[PDB]
């Protein structure tokens, strides 16, 4: 259901309301979260509990607008020492989105000796997280660097790298375009200094069903927005997104753009394609609007408003909720 989130003068909650809309409208997340009964509760201040109360309202309430203040407060108390997501202070929607996924893992999984999440109920690691390792490899002399493995919830790519690689290419290529843009500046010397140069290689070993792309902007009033919006594709081939994709489920995976958090003028909003109405919705806190059934309708609005897309959410339509 498409409802709005209230934002009063001074509480600066548009960064949270933008992320909340993505999480509620993402099918793999919402259906998964509903089947979740037990959680590591933090007490009167607890993100999971505040999130559940918001999600229950999104379905049972008849109000056209709902308050996110419970999650806003719980987020503030949880990050008091870090001085992030504090009450009355603006913040970043992608940082908010990342940390909500991270705290969902803390609420769902259990502390493992080696910090390895295998819980089949953890939405973040089972569906969102990308498991990668980076390595320098020289084809001429055969030298290789030490592999550096890590997990990320968002894949960040530079907007200028994206725009430049689009001009060079001038659908079904957006994955390759994203990969060439991400690797553009990753030139390094051979690990053994044969004299040749190498490109950092990223290898994905898992198979996320939701890829969250983060756009690295050059400015808060970017003059590259229009070129960025026109460079965005609606279909992502996961097998092309990284230099190597070793998991068979991910080689075959095709993910479609269903959501996009947008920044403009120190404010945040969210576009999302509701699969039911078969149309693109727009959520700016309390304001919910029908944009249209065509991606071009979203392009026209983003370009007219000088919107800067920050988070792109590609969901596998053949994806499944957590078991």
């Amino acid at each position: 259901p498409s409802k709005g989130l209230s934002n009063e003068p001074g509480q600066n909650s548009c960064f949270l309301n933008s992320a909340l809309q993505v999480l509620w409208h993402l099918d793999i997340f919402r259906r998964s979260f509903r089947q979740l009964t037990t959680h590591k509760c933090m007490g009167d201040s607890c993100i999971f509990c505040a999130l559940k109360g918001i999600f229950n309202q999104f379905q049972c309430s008849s109000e056209k607008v709902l308050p996110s203040d419970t999650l806003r407060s719980a987020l503030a108390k949880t990050f008091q020492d870090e001085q992030r997501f504090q009450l009355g202070i603006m913040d970043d929607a992608a940082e908010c989105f990342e940390n909500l996924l991270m705290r969902i893992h803390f609420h769902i999984a259990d502390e493992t000796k080696e910090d390895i999440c295998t819980a089949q109920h953890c939405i973040s690691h089972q569906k969102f997280a990308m498991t990668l390792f980076e390595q320098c490899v020289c084809t001429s002399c055969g030298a290789t660097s030490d592999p550096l493995p890590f997990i990320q919830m968002v894949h960040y790519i530079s907007t200028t790298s994206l725009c430049n690689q689009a001009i060079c290419m001038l659908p079904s290529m957006f994955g390759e375009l994203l990969q060439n843009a991400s690797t553009m500046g990753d030139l390094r010397n051979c690990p053994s200094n044969c004299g040749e140069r190498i490109r950092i290689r990223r290898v994905l070993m898992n198979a996320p069903q939701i890829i969250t792309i983060g756009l690295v902007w050059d400015s808060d009033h970017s003059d590259l927005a229009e070129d960025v919006i026109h460079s965005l594709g609606t279909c992502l081939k996961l097998g092309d997104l990284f230099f190597r994709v070793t998991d068979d489920r991910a080689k075959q995976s095709e993910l479609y753009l269903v959501g996009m958090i947008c920044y403009y003028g120190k404010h945040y909003s969210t576009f999302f394609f509701q699969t039911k109405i078969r149309k693109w919705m727009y959520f700016d806190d309390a304001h919910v609007k029908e944009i249209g059934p065509k991606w071009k309708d979203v392009v026209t609005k983003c370009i007219k408003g000088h919107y800067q897309p920050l988070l792109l959410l590609y969901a596998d339509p053949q994806g499944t909720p957590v078991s």
Binding site: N12, C14, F15, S18, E82, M90, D91, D92, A93, A94, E95, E98, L132, E134, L148, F150, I151, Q152, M153, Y156, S158, T159, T160, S161, N164, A181, M184, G185, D186, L187, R188, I200, G214, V216, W217, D218, S219, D220, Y263, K266, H267, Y268, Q308, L310
Partner: protein, 75 residues
């Protein structure tokens, strides 16, 4: 000690740094080279964001390590 920073434009720069350097120290070196103010700087290493008050040694930042710079957009 030499570390790399992937900047907002995708270019890779070189930071001369010490293991005992706080990342606020690193953010200041990035400001002089790249012009981005510190509060708008997001440093990611191995998928995790570096949080102020810590040093490069805390995160095992070693030579030839790469920091991924993301611009923070407060809204």
């Amino acid at each position: 000690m030499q570390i790399f920073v992937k900047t907002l434009t995708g270019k890779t720069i070189t930071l001369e740094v010490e293991p005992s350097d706080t990342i606020e120290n690193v953010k200041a070196k990035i400001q002089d080279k790249e012009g981005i103010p510190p509060d708008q700087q997001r440093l990611i290493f191995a998928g995790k964001q570096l949080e102020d008050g810590r040093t490069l040694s805390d995160y095992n930042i070693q030579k030839e390590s790469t920091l991924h710079l993301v611009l923070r957009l407060r809204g």
